[PDB]
């Protein structure tokens, strides 16, 4: 997350860390949507251009975390995966259209002060809230700035970072990139004239874009961090999987395999 700040303890109890067993390293963010289903972006698991194709035995999910690197004894829970499900029409060839995957945990996780699921939107919450100008919130342990590289500066955070960003109107999203954008994506970020900054960045993929309903006070997950060109570049915006457009596939998978 670029230009965000440290999260408060318990501020995003649905945030999940996808963690590679060997080498032990951060893979992607993810979110807890029930006691045994985690939602993430499909490209975290399958991306043939970079030869990524992970299976269940390659990964662990770590839930209830705050520190990026510490094993948080007595707070975090670690679970193994029973099965991964990638959207059958995920388009990794062109534009990461339908970038969404579900993961079934081997055993249910117990909830706590630090571990609690986010809600998935219904038609009407999506309708009232997914509007240009309305802000949502993104969280993750990804890089703090685009570059740094293998040089000086560091750039990986000590704890979970958070940033609040406005949804941008679809014309503006479309005119900022050469990628073909679909109805299954939306973009968010400040415009150059607005004088505030912020964005997701490398390592934040798969993480939740959430909004708090003013009608019932609950937090709903509206987006999944999917792609962007650079991190926090003026005139460029972050793109997110539109979770409500893909909800019928989510419901189907959980009803058939849960």
């Amino acid at each position: 997350i670029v230009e965000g700040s440290d999260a408060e303890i318990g501020m995003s109890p649905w945030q999940v860390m996808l963690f590679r067993k060997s080498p032990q390293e951060l893979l992607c963010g993810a979110s807890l949507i029930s006691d045994r289903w985690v939602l993430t972006a499909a490209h975290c698991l399958l991306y043939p251009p970079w030869d990524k194709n992970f299976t269940e035995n390659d990964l662990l999910v770590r839930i209830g975390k705050h520190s990026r690197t510490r094993y948080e004894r007595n707070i975090e829970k670690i679970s193994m995966l029973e099965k991964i499900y990638i959207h059958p029409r995920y388009n990794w060839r062109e534009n990461l259209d339908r970038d969404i995957a579900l993961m079934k945990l081997k055993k249910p996780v117990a909830f706590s002060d630090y571990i609690h699921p986010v809600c998935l939107p219904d038609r009407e919450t999506a309708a009232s809230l997914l509007q240009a100008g309305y802000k949502g919130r993104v969280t993750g342990w990804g890089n703090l700035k685009e570059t740094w590289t293998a040089n000086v500066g560091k750039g990986q955070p000590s704890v979970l970072q958070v940033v609040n960003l406005p949804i941008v109107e679809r014309p503006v999203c479309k005119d900022s990139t050469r990628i073909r954008i679909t109805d299954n994506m939306f973009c968010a970020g400040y415009k150059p004239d607005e004088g505030k900054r912020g964005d997701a960045c490398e390592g934040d993929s798969g993480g939740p874009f959430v909004m708090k309903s003013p009608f019932n006070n609950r937090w709903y997950q509206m987006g999944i961090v999917s792609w962007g060109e650079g991190c926090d570049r003026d005139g460029k915006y972050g793109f997110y999987t539109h979770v409500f457009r893909l909800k019928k596939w989510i419901q189907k998978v959980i009803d058939q395999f849960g």
Binding site: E8, M11, H116, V118, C119, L120, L129, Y134, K135, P214
Partner: peptide
């Protein structure tokens, strides 16, 4: 998950607000 989704143990359930959530609620004009 389910019935209780989206209500945080340390904030909504205790009626405490985090430091920047009013920014989100203030933009829902």
């Amino acid at each position: 998950g389910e019935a209780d989704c989206g209500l945080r143990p340390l904030f909504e359930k205790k009626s405490l607000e985090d430091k920047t959530e009013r920014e989100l609620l203030e933009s829902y004009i």
